[PDB]
Amino acid sequence: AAQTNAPWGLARISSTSPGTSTYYYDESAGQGSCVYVIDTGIEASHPEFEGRAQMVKTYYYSSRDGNGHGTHCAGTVGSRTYGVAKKTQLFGVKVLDDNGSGQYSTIIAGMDFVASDKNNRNCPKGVVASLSLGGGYSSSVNSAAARLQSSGVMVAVAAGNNNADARNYSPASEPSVCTVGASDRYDRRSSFSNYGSVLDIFGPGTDILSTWIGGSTRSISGTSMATPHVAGLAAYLMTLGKTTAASACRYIADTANKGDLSNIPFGTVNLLAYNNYQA
Numbered sequence: 001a002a003q004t005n006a007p008w009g010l011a012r013i014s015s016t017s018p019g020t021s022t023y024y025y026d027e028s029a030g031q032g033s034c035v036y037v038i039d040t041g042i043e044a045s046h047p048e049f050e051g052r053a054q055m056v057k058t059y060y061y062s063s064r065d066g067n068g069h070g071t072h073c074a075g076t077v078g079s080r081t082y083g084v085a086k087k088t089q090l091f092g093v094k095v096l097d098d099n100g101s102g103q104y105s106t107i108i109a110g111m112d113f114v115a116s117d118k119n120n121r122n123c124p125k126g127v128v129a130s131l132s133l134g135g136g137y138s139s140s141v142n143s144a145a146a147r148l149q150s151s152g153v154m155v156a157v158a159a160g161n162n163n164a165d166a167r168n169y170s171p172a173s174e175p176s177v178c179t180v181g182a183s184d185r186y187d188r189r190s191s192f193s194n195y196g197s198v199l200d201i202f203g204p205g206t207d208i209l210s211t212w213i214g215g216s217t218r219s220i221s222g223t224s225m226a227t228p229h230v231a232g233l234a235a236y237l238m239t240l241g242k243t244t245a246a247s248a249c250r251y252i253a254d255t256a257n258k259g260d261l262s263n264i265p266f267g268t269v270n271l272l273a274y275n276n277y278q279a
C-alpha cells in the first residue's frame with residue numbers, strides 16, 4: 001500500500017532518505033494488535049478512528065479528552081490518515097487531566113491497570129502501551145514501567161523535551177522499556193529532544209500533523225509525537241510476526257537507519273525507526 005502526500009513523519013519511517021512524501025506500508029496495518037494510549041484520553045468519536053478507539057479507564061470525573069494531546073498521539077498510532085498502524089485497536093486510559101498533568105500515583109495505577117486489563121481484551125497479535133509523558137526521576141515509576149513490560153506489553157516512552165540526559169527522567173530512564181527521542185524533517189536531532197545512553201531509538205517528532213479534538217487536526221512537536229510513531233511501528237511489526245513484545249524494541253534498533261541523524265552527542269544511539277517495507 002502507498003499513501004501519497006502523507007505527513008513527513010510517516011514517509012520517513014518507510015524511507016532510507018529524507019524528503020520523500022509517500023508512506024509505503026504493509027496492508028495488514030496492525031490489525032489484530034492493540035495499543036493502550038496512556039495520556040489525556042481519546043476523542044473516540046473522531047471520524048479518523050473509524051470506530052476503532054475506545055475509552056476503557058479514567059481516573060477523573062470524565063473520560064473525555066479535553067486537552068487534545070491524547071487524541072493527537074492516538075492519531076499517530078492509529079488514525080486512518082495520520083497513523084502508523086491504520087487498522088490497530090486503540091484503548092484510551094486517561095491518567096492526565098485536561099491541563100496535561102497527573103500525579104505519579106495515578107500514572108502508576110494506570111500502568112498497573114493496563115497489565116491486568118489486557119487479559120480481558122481480544123488482542124491476538126499482541127499488546128503495546130504508548131506513554132508520551134514523564135517527569136523527574138522516580139524508581140517507583142520506573143518499576144511500574146518495568147512491571148508493565150515484564151507482563152508482556154511492549155512499552156514505548158518519550159525521552160522528554162529538556163535537551164538533557166534522559167537519565168534523570170522517568171519512566172524514560174527505565175532500561176527495560178523503549179525510550180524514544182525525536183527528529184525533524186532534515187534528519188537533525190530535534191532541538192528539544194533528550195539524549196543519552198538510555199535512549200533506544202529516534203522517531204519523527206517536529207511538526208507532526210495528527211488528529212485533534214472537535215474532529216479537527218493540527219501539527220505540534222515533541223518527543224510525545226515521536227513515541228507513538230514507534231509504538232505504532234511495534235504493533236505494525238507484531239501483527240506481521242517479525243518480533244514479540246519482549247523483543248520489539250531491540251528488533252527496531254537492529255533494523256533502523258543507522259548514522260543518518262545530525263547533532264547526536266557522543267554516547268547516544270544514531271538509530272532512526274524504519275519499517276523496511278519491500279513491495
Ligand SMILES: [Ca+2]
Pocket residue numbers: 174175176177178179198199200
Ligand atoms: Ca531501553
